Design an enzyme around this catalytic site. Structure first.
Site, mmCIF file in Angstrom:
data_model
loop_
_atom_site.group_PDB
_atom_site.id
_atom_site.type_symbol
_atom_site.label_atom_id
_atom_site.label_comp_id
_atom_site.label_asym_id
_atom_site.label_seq_id
_atom_site.Cartn_x
_atom_site.Cartn_y
_atom_site.Cartn_z
ATOM 1 N N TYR A 40 0.802 -1.217 0.000
ATOM 2 C CA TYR A 40 0.000 0.000 0.000
ATOM 3 C C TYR A 40 0.829 1.256 0.000
ATOM 4 C CZ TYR A 40 1.184 0.808 4.874
ATOM 5 O OH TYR A 40 1.854 1.062 6.042
ATOM 6 N N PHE A 50 2.140 9.847 3.236
ATOM 7 C CA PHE A 50 2.492 9.671 4.655
ATOM 8 C C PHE A 50 3.145 8.314 4.970
ATOM 9 C CE2 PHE A 50 -2.176 8.763 4.560
ATOM 10 C CZ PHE A 50 -2.205 7.485 5.071
ATOM 11 N N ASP A 51 2.878 7.277 4.176
ATOM 12 C CA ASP A 51 3.438 5.929 4.383
ATOM 13 C C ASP A 51 3.282 5.033 3.170
ATOM 14 O OD1 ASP A 51 4.898 4.579 6.488
ATOM 15 O OD2 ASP A 51 3.189 3.227 6.772
ATOM 16 N N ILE A 70 -7.099 0.505 10.861
ATOM 17 C CA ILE A 70 -8.226 1.427 10.897
ATOM 18 C C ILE A 70 -9.491 0.766 10.357
ATOM 19 C CG2 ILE A 70 -6.963 3.593 11.091
ATOM 20 C CD1 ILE A 70 -7.361 3.848 7.961
ATOM 21 N N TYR A 96 -8.585 8.032 11.802
ATOM 22 C CA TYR A 96 -8.029 8.461 13.083
ATOM 23 C C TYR A 96 -8.852 9.549 13.803
ATOM 24 C CZ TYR A 96 -4.137 5.531 11.683
ATOM 25 O OH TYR A 96 -3.411 4.424 11.311
ATOM 26 N N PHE A 113 -5.740 5.611 0.085
ATOM 27 C CA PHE A 113 -4.797 4.518 0.014
ATOM 28 C C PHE A 113 -4.919 3.800 -1.285
ATOM 29 C CE2 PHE A 113 -5.343 4.815 4.657
ATOM 30 C CZ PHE A 113 -4.090 4.531 5.161
HETATM 31 C C1 K0T Z 1 1.525 3.268 14.975
HETATM 32 N N1 K0T Z 1 2.056 4.175 13.970
HETATM 33 C C2 K0T Z 1 3.236 4.954 14.308
HETATM 34 C C3 K0T Z 1 1.934 3.745 12.597
HETATM 35 C C4 K0T Z 1 2.676 2.682 12.088
HETATM 36 C C5 K0T Z 1 2.451 2.209 10.804
HETATM 37 C C6 K0T Z 1 1.489 2.763 10.008
HETATM 38 C C7 K0T Z 1 0.698 3.852 10.461
HETATM 39 C C8 K0T Z 1 -0.295 4.502 9.659
HETATM 40 S S1 K0T Z 1 -0.928 3.794 8.158
HETATM 41 O O1 K0T Z 1 0.154 3.650 7.234
HETATM 42 O O2 K0T Z 1 -2.077 4.558 7.789
HETATM 43 N N2 K0T Z 1 -1.458 2.281 8.537
HETATM 44 C C9 K0T Z 1 -0.721 1.070 8.077
HETATM 45 C C10 K0T Z 1 -1.600 0.208 7.192
HETATM 46 C C11 K0T Z 1 -2.808 0.974 6.713
HETATM 47 C C12 K0T Z 1 -3.695 1.409 7.871
HETATM 48 C C13 K0T Z 1 -2.872 2.081 8.977
HETATM 49 C C14 K0T Z 1 -3.172 1.408 10.317
HETATM 50 O O3 K0T Z 1 -4.316 1.043 10.588
HETATM 51 N N3 K0T Z 1 -2.135 1.290 11.156
HETATM 52 C C15 K0T Z 1 -2.216 0.682 12.475
HETATM 53 C C16 K0T Z 1 -0.811 0.557 13.074
HETATM 54 C C17 K0T Z 1 0.077 -0.411 12.282
HETATM 55 C C18 K0T Z 1 1.501 -0.571 12.763
HETATM 56 C C19 K0T Z 1 2.487 -1.036 11.894
HETATM 57 C C20 K0T Z 1 3.799 -1.183 12.322
HETATM 58 C C21 K0T Z 1 4.149 -0.852 13.618
HETATM 59 C C22 K0T Z 1 3.177 -0.396 14.490
HETATM 60 C C23 K0T Z 1 1.862 -0.267 14.070
HETATM 61 C C24 K0T Z 1 -3.155 1.452 13.410
HETATM 62 O O4 K0T Z 1 -3.110 2.677 13.461
HETATM 63 N N4 K0T Z 1 -4.029 0.716 14.110
HETATM 64 C C25 K0T Z 1 -5.018 1.267 15.023
HETATM 65 C C26 K0T Z 1 -6.373 0.581 14.822
HETATM 66 C C27 K0T Z 1 -7.522 0.948 15.756
HETATM 67 C C28 K0T Z 1 -8.740 0.275 15.136
HETATM 68 N N5 K0T Z 1 -9.927 0.486 15.981
HETATM 69 C C29 K0T Z 1 -11.081 -0.036 15.838
HETATM 70 N N6 K0T Z 1 -12.127 0.203 16.633
HETATM 71 N N7 K0T Z 1 -11.257 -0.878 14.814
HETATM 72 C C30 K0T Z 1 -4.531 1.121 16.456
HETATM 73 O O5 K0T Z 1 -4.486 -0.130 16.857
HETATM 74 O O6 K0T Z 1 -4.205 2.077 17.141
HETATM 75 C C31 K0T Z 1 -0.906 5.649 10.087
HETATM 76 C C32 K0T Z 1 -0.627 6.168 11.343
HETATM 77 C C33 K0T Z 1 0.250 5.545 12.181
HETATM 78 C C34 K0T Z 1 0.949 4.375 11.775
#
Ligand code: K0T
Length: 131
Positions: A40, A50-51, A70, A96, A113
């Site tokens: 993606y 952004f990513d 998300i 978010y 995306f």
């Molecule tokens: C944590 N930080 C610094 C970030 C790391 C990596 C990507 C990030 C993205 S992103 O590129 O837009 N992404 C990745 C894939 C597409 C969707 C989106 C995404 O979703 N990500 C996850 C985190 C994924 C991850 C990957 C590697 C290491 C750490 C974390 C995310 O946020 N989950 C939320 C979901 C809450 C869902 N509630 C609900 N009620 N369903 C969370 O559990 O809090 C955006 C912002 C922060 C990013």
């Protein structure tokens, strides 16, 4: 810049919009609990990237419909076929919200995306594109 697509949100409130850019093969879509593998790129509405998983050594993986990603992603990836490339428009309620995700995502941001579904691992069957 463009917010295009079919409204695929369960509430039908335009929270999640999808455009298929490349049709996938097969008929099967991943189920809740299946592990999904994608590539993606995410952009803000102002065109700011952004990513991107393409910048990394392999595909991005997670379990579908478990709230690990998300809301918009749990909704959208469930409608994808293997090999499909789509564009997903995520309203803040399905991303978010008013908090955002500093520093790359600001408050009340609509996200775009481009997603390619490479593989899904189901209970008994794994489906993937050739490579
Ligand atoms: C944590 N930080 C610094 C970030 C790391 C990596 C990507 C990030 C993205 S992103 O590129 O837009 N992404 C990745 C894939 C597409 C969707 C989106 C995404 O979703 N990500 C996850 C985190 C994924 C991850 C990957 C590697 C290491 C750490 C974390 C995310 O946020 N989950 C939320 C979901 C809450 C869902 N509630 C609900 N009620 N369903 C969370 O559990 O809090 C955006 C912002 C922060 C990013």
């Amino acid at each position: 810049l463009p917010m295009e697509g079919v409204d695929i949100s369960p509430k039908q409130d335009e929270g999640v919009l999808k455009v298929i850019k490349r049709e996938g093969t097969g008929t099967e879509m991943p189920m809740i609990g299946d592990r999904v593998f994608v590539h993606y790129t995410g952009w803000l509405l102002d065109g700011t990237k952004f990513d991107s998983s393409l910048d990394r050594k392999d595909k991005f993986s997670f379990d579908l419909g478990k709230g690990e990603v998300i809301k918009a992603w749990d909704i959208a990836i469930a409608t994808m076929k293997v090999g499909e490339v789509c564009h997903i428009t995520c309203k803040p309620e399905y991303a978010y919200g008013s908090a955002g995700s500093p520093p790359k995502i600001p408050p009340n941001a609509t996200l775009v995306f481009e997603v390619e579904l490479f593989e899904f691992k189901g209970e008994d069957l794994t489906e993937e594109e050739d490579g």
